[PDB]
Structures are given as structure tokens and as C-alpha cells.
A and B are shown apart, each in its own frame.
Chain A
């Protein structure tokens, strides 16, 4: 019965079996992580078949298998969309997850709760598939919040450490700010189009107004950490390195860009939202590439690189090229994950040290790690014929040949120079020169799990661009006519960034010491955004929620007006009424007054 649907559903279904096995006698043994890794590899090789079917005949499907509940005119059903985006993203995500789980089998070997860690990673993967294949907005929101909660749990893995809990709560806060816009889009779409499912929404909105698209943009900015809501992603490096390689670099953080790619038919007919997306992406990529070039923690550098690449993805969406943005997501996953994996290898070898200022000459001490990191850096910088090139080169040359904001174009070019500059910094500082680490040398990368995982991701980072570019149907109109200088703009700016960073890193060898400028202080302290925005709003919010909401209103004035006033009045009148001396003279005089008043007041009027 056209095995496409059955295979696409089995790929997602077999991922949940190790979750159902979490209360069996496999979860208490030391075979559980290998079991989960084998399950993920099997899921990947199974998902490879629907991809081949699509690449052969372009087949696409939607499956509404279960009818969950029905409203008066709205029907909600468990529905899966199996178009190009899903059937292309699922194998890439499964491949990356397989490599990262095999890496974690070595990186987290000394963790007493590795079984739980593997279960957690698997849970995140399931929620991401739910997000990616969802056909209606409620299912997509389920996946959205699932991956958010999974990232919260994985960031605070070391729950005895205060900073990890702070980073997890910060991630939740920013993603809730985005969730506001997600809910706004949901409410607008239901009250105006009468549906949450994707097919109906496209049909009823030929010219989509501003509000739903602005809500979608806010949600995407929250999930992909754009300039307004950026800081949580770098602070998410508090979790273990495998979490940073899988969730916060390649798969979970592209969710906002994927959400905008899903709703591209509506974004195609609104110029203002497109312009806002383009400008947001441009400022995000420039700001994060500028922050990355002066960071000393290697994980921070890779996190800022990921944020800048997300900004570039947003820019690509802003110029009405969603398929290029999707291709860039698929291309970036490989080398970003492998770069984080090499960083984790270096960190583990040097006794959990992350500062690049204490990393010496690892070019010779770490040959395979050096080779992998060099290949990943060259691919990230869009070196010709590599995986990065088949997306980033086209993105740059499509930004150049469009009617677009000029400032956005300038910031995109400066950011793509700063990318090469930051990549150069890691290589020069981490691999060249003389050792700076403690003298008890424990460097050892001879472990088959690490070698195999990084080798798989390296083959990906070398050949995936060519293979996937040649195996997809043309969904764009190519730019076949460019001035020669503009065709080489990306290469020229990359080379200039390379040379400038090399000069500025070579001058550190001189015996000259000068105090830093204000530009360096701005770049290193992330423009003072976390220093101000994490102190002023939080202080005012908490202080007002104590002084005014709790004390001034609830404990004082709301008490004062209704119950305290009643008690005071009743007590005063009780004292007035009950305090008589018991002398018959006084209240018999009172009786006389009452009798006289009564005859005239009520008796005279009959």
C-alpha cells in the first residue's frame, strides 16, 4: 500500500520503544546507552527509504490517523505532514543524534546517571520529530513545548550547581516570551480561518495580515534566539557538551527558522513582516559574530557562532528564499555538531578545561581532532565545494541580487567576515603555539567511539553538500548573471577576515602591554546586554511584586477596606450600645423621649 506512509510512521514509532523499556531490566544494566544508540541508528537507516522515494518521484503525503476530539465546526486530529522538509530533516537529525549518542558513550562514561541521560536525549529527539512532522498548530505547539522542557531538564543536568539552574530558568523565560506570540498566532488563526490545520490556513489566507505573521516572527525569534531574546543560548552551555552539540547547536535551535519555513506561503505575500525578519536576522548575525571574536571559553565561541548562523538563516528567509534556508539548516547541522564534538574532545583530554588561554599546541598532540576541527572550520567559512558552500555561497549571492535593505546587506557581509575571524581565533589559540596546560599530560584521543563518531560527521561535512544539492529538484530560480566582483564577494570578505584576524593574533607575541579600549570591552561583555537586562527588569519586577502586590495591596489596603473597617465599626457600635451604667433613671428618661417622639413622628401622621 505504497510503503511511504508506513515507513515514515515506523521511523517515528520505533524511537519510543526504549522509552517504554525504561522500567525494565535493561535500564538498570550498563547496556542501555548502546541499546538506545542502536535504536537511533536503525531509525536512521529506516528513514533513508522514504527520502529515496521522494528523490525519485517527489512523493509527498499527509496522514491524519487519529481523530482526537471535535469542536462544533473545528476538527482536531493527529496529523503528520510528510513533505520535502520532513523527509529531508528527519534523516539528518537521526544521523547527527546517532553520532552524538556514540560520542556521549565515551564523554559521559563516569556519570552515575548515564542511563537517565540517554533516556533524556532520546526524549528530546522524539519531541523534535513531533515538532517537525506536525500538520496542525496544536501538534506543533506540543512539540515546541516538549523540546523546551527537555532543554530545561538537560541544561540543569548538574542540579546541585546554582548557575545551571539559573541558565535553565533563563531559557524557559525567553521561550515563554516567544510562546506568547505562538499563542497569539494560534488564536488569530482559529478565530479568522476557523482551523489549526495547515491546508485550510493556506487556502483561506491569500493575503495574510500583519498580526498572525508578527506572532509567528516573535515565536521564531524566541526559539532561535534573535537579538531581542538572544542571551539564553550562550548561557545554555552550562549543560554537558553532548547537550550543547545536539540541542543548542544543530537541531533544537533551528525550530524558529523551521516554523517560518513552514508558513512561507503566507510570508510570501507580506512585505512588512519580510522586512522585519530580514532586519532582525541581520542585526542578530552581526551582533553575535561581533561578540564571538573576543570570547575565551571555546563553548561560548561555538554558541555565538550558532547564533550568528541562525541570524543568517533569518536573513535568508527575509529575502523570500525559504528553501535555501532549509538547505542551510541541513548543511549546518553536520559541521556545527562536529565542531562542538571536537571542542568536547579537547575539554575532556585537558581535565575539563574550557578556557582557550590554557590550551597549547594540539596540532601534533591531537592529530585527528585537529584534522576534524580544521575541516569543520573550513566548511563553516564556506570554502568552495564543501558542505557549507552549497548553502552559504548561494545565500550571500542571493542577498546581493535582491531589492533589499542596504544596511542589512552591509551587516551580513561584515558578519560573514567576522565568522572567519572567530574560527581563526579558535585554531590559532587552541592548536598552534606552545603548551599552556598543566604539566601532567593526560592527552589521549585513542578511543574507537570518539573516532567513529567524528569520522562519520566528517564524511558528512565533506560530501553532504554536493550530494544533497544534486539530489533535490529545483525549487528556486538561479542567479546566472552576476558581475565578476560580486560573484566573489563572499570569498573576498572571508579572505580579508582571515588575514586581519591572523595579523591581530600574531601581534599578541610582542612584548607590548596596553590597556584595552572601550570597543574591546563592549565586544567581550556582550554589549552589556546581560549586565543591564538581567538586573534592572528583574529587580523592578520582584521589588514591585513584593512591595506593591503583596504588601501594599493584599496585606494592607484590601484588608483595610473590607474586613478591618467592618470589625472596627461593629466593635465601636458594640461599645456604644452595651456600656450603660444600669441606672433606671437614665433609660426611663430615654423611655419618655421615645414615647413623645413616637406620638408625633408616627402617631400624628395617620
Chain B
């Protein structure tokens, strides 16, 4: 349904075959499905219609909270406590958002594996590639910080990685 965006959680076009009866015998599954429909799906639908009718008479909205962007930990003086506090809060929010991004990608991967059935090893290559990329990025950013993590430790990790990459690049240039 329209509850979620179908671009963030995509699905294939859902091709299903038409029934081709080849026996004179009746199909018990169809008879049981008709019984289940008429006996379960209709009263539930009526109850849902009543509940939605009651809901439409009382409609109110809640809004997603917006946050502005503040200076990062790089634009803060060494002992400036207030700027450090704002930067740390913003960094923590970004960490939560990145965790949720990884969660979305993992949900895509699991849904693909279940959906594709016996052809999952070939039909889910793109989702596996996306998860590998996002996992590599996330791992670089936050792994090994440990408990008592902060924006300063993440910055130190990034600086160390940049220094190593610069040295490797300059030594490969001399080759």
C-alpha cells in the first residue's frame, strides 16, 4: 500500500500465472478459499470500514521534526564546550541515521533472498553489492571506536586513515 515509499523499498512487477485446470475433479483449494473469503474476509472488512469511518470524523496530524545543521567538530576550538556539545549531538544523530540506512539495506537484502526462492544466488546480486558497499562505508566510519565513542575519536580515526592513504599514494607515485 501507500504507507511506505516504493522507491526506498522496491519490488519486482509481481508476475503470477493464470490457473490452467487439467482435471475433471474440483479443486478443494478454490472451494476452501471461497469459504474463507466469505466467512472471514468480509466481516473483517466491515469492521475495518466502521473503524475507518469513525477515524475520518477525527483527523489530526503529527509532523516530522526538522533539525538545522550546526558546525561540525572540525570547526570547534580545543576547549570550546558549547560548540563541542552541539557538534557531538549532531554527530550522534547522524550515527543513528546511518544505522537506519544500514537497516533499510539489510531489509532489502532479506526480502530479496526470500522472494527469489531457489534462484536467490543469482537474482539478488545487486542487493548483495549494495549491502557490501554500505557495510564497508559504515565499518570505516564507526567500527573500533568502542564504548565511550565520540565525534573526536571518529575524527582521529578519519585523520589516521587519510594519513595512511596519503602515504600509500605518495609511495605508489614514486614507483
Contacts and interface: CB of A to CB of B under 8 A. Distances in A.
B32 A199 contact: no
A520 to B, nearest CB: 52
A200 B106 contact: yes
Interface stretch (A49-57, A354-362, A552-560): A49-57
B33 to A, nearest CB: 7
Contact of B36 (A3, A202, A204, A206): A3
Interface residues of B, number: 26
Contacts of B114: 62, 199
A60 B106 CA distance: 21
Interface string A1-30: 101001100000000000000000000000
Interface in B112-168: 113-114, 117, 120-121, 124, 128, 135, 138
B110 A197 contact: yes
B29 interface: yes
A73 interface: yes
Interface residues of A, number: 24
Nearest to B127: A203
| Residue of A73, A195, A204 with highest tally of chain B CB at under 10 A | A73
A6 B102 CA distance: 31
A200 B99 contact: no
A64 to B, nearest CB: 9
B29 A203 contact: no
A148 to B, nearest CB: 29
A6 B28 CA distance: 18
Nearest to A60: B117
A75 interface: yes
Contacts, number: 52
Nearest to A52: B29
Contacts of B124: 203
Interface on chain B toward A: helix, strand, loop, or mixed SS? helix
A101 B27 CA distance: 33
B41 interface: yes
A72 B102 CA distance: 9
B33 A3 contact: yes
B107 to A, nearest CB: 8
A1 B106 contact: no
Given A6-B40, A203-B113, A203-B128, A52 B99 contact: no
A56 B111 CA distance: 24
Contacts of A195: 106, 110
A202 B29 contact: no
Contacts of B37: 3
Interface in A198-220: 199-200, 202-204, 206
A53 B32 CA distance: 10
26 contacts: A3-B33, A3-B36, A3-B40, A49-B32, A52-B28, A52-B29, A52-B32, A53-B29, A56-B29, A70-B103, A73-B103, A73-B106, A73-B138, A194-B106, A194-B135, A195-B106, A197-B110, A199-B109, A199-B113, A200-B110, A200-B113, A202-B113, A203-B109, A203-B110, A203-B113, A204-B128
The 5 closest A-B pairs by CB, nearest first: A199-B113, A199-B110, A3-B36, A56-B29, A72-B99
Given A52-B29, A56-B29, A73-B138, 5 more contacts: A3-B37, A49-B32, A52-B32, A75-B106, A200-B109
